Amino acid sequence: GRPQRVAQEMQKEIALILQREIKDPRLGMMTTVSGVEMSRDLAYAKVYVTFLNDKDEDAVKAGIKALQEASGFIRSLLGKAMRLRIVPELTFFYDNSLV
Amino acid sequence: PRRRVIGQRKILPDPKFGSELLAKFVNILMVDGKKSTAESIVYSALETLAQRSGKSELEAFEVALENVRPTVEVKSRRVGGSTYQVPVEVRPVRRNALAMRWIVEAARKRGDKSMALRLANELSDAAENKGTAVKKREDVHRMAEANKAFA
Amino acid sequence: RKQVSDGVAHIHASFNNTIVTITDRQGNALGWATAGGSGFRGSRKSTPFAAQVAAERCADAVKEYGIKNLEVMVKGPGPGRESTIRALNAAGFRITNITDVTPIPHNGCRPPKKRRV
RNA sequence: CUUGAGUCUCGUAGAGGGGGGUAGAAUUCCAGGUGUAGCGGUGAAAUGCGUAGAGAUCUGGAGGAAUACCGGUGGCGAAGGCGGCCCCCUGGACGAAGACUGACGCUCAGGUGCGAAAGCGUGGGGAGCAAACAGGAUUAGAUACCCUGGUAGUCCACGCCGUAAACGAUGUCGACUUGGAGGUUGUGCCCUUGAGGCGUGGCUUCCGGAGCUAACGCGUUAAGUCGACCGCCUGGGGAGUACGGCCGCAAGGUUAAAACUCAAAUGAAUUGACGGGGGCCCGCACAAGCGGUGGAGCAUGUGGUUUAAUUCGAUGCAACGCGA
């Protein structure tokens, strides 16, 4: 379907499987997701994660590192959850909400 | 400038006074590679500015220039797929060049039925923190920090 | 109108809205503002900026009750938890603890079918 | 006769099965406290909900269904399947050491039983969910996808149905044939003993050798080397259809053709092509700059129109001060 509708739905699903089904102590901080933008093809998607812990890079760096290392696990969960064709490749990014 | 960010060339110091920044100025208002004409206009304008100032031409020129040097300006950028009108702080040589260009442009558009005369007029004006060049620096700063959202 | 000086803020952070309500420690509510009721609709109805706007609009309606000590309980992993938290933190309030309390069942009821989009 | 197959003894692990209790979250609803104008929903919207007071929040109650965490590249079961906890009844598997029986074995047409989900009959139940349906939208069109509702059904009891990509697309049983890394469950012996070391079984996951295979791959749980029995195949379509029988309340299942038509249909692997991809990385490509063209007059070329003729050719970049 349209990339933005799939973007909204995938934001919902990533937020869900990010709040509940994680066990990495590197993650935490009520990690939210501001949104996710994906290409016209649904093959690739970029998530904009927003952390809470102090914005000091020592921690948000570790958070994005853990997310990128668990991307395979999150992709498997997404593929079983949200019922689409290709299970896009995920790329996490710190959304600098404070500007 | 995609592979190797290229540096800047070294202007040799001004002939009469000895200021490399005055050399950059005379290069900046030089039209059609006519050096001597712009050089004479600048020398005549600086002397006229000095008589009212009662100060050395290099210092009065410096105080007028720093009165025009901006510190922040707008930039059209693309980072998140948006027409980012980001305010960003300027580099020293960049703000020098912008000040010189702005005062040259304001002088050129003033007219005053001469060139050295109008240049000295608006240099003395920018010295007292008034004029279109200063007006345009304040307008740039206003446009920049009217959108503080992206800092 | 009275003085409690120690309340708790429920933040229902839906994927389409954000409902902040400050209540007495025994569940009796005091006031509430919504991201929708703050002059936002459609997408903006569920954006973090509107969430903090709603948080501040709700704080401005309980200040006469005299509180600056809060525990907050968030529900729903919607965008607009971070926002309202930092908002009511920037509203002179002292937050002692923030707690995730989203209702998670132990396989209670069957969820609605996935949207085919 | 005891080596195959069984029996006994002592133990071990297990969502194996049937029955009955019970607990804690959550959804919904009902009644109250607090508390006021929104809630809900979408890519945007409306249908919907609320001034009779919703939503949000706390307390209490009712009811139904399913059992987060543990949870496992785990376990049990012939397969289908099986997931809170507790009791009762009950099936199988495995191990240690013996004792016992003495080929009692393997396979199996017909036959019998079991057999997801949907469906059927009778009665009960009904929170959530949800074919059909009713709306709201979107769209050329929407009888779809999306949204708000929502009946059968999903749940229970007793019968019926007997089909699934019921799959490891791999029949059952037995023997034999190099390795390595795990999981899980027994067990023997030894060390100062927990810890640890050296063994030895069952089940199971993943690499890989010989060998096999069209290749992909399989590889001691074979698709390797052999034996026993059973099922099944014979080009694609017609067609798992017709007819007949048998079965079923029905839906239909099962058994199962031929005429006719076509010269292929197919499996595995190979090289490329097509993206309205991913990027990496370059170029005055953009950016940072300076000067222009687009307006004016004229020069010149072209198109067009005109003319007896306005000779011919060059026509996106790469024709148009071009052949000249």
Ligand SMILES: [Mg+2]
């Ligand atoms: Mg939304």
Ligand SMILES: [Mg+2]
């Ligand atoms: Mg049991």
Ligand SMILES: [Mg+2]
């Ligand atoms: Mg009821």
Ligand SMILES: [Mg+2]
């Ligand atoms: Mg004997």
Ligand SMILES: [Mg+2]
């Ligand atoms: Mg048979």
Ligand SMILES: [Mg+2]
């Ligand atoms: Mg059924």
Ligand SMILES: [Mg+2]
């Ligand atoms: Mg019917």
Ligand SMILES: [Mg+2]
């Ligand atoms: Mg029935």
Ligand SMILES: [Mg+2]
């Ligand atoms: Mg009935």
Ligand SMILES: [Mg+2]
């Ligand atoms: Mg519904």
Ligand SMILES: [Mg+2]
């Ligand atoms: Mg069959």
Ligand SMILES: [Mg+2]
């Ligand atoms: Mg199965």
Ligand SMILES: [Mg+2]
């Ligand atoms: Mg088969």
Ligand SMILES: [Mg+2]
């Ligand atoms: Mg065998």
Ligand SMILES: [Mg+2]
């Ligand atoms: Mg087994």
Ligand SMILES: [Mg+2]
């Ligand atoms: Mg192998």
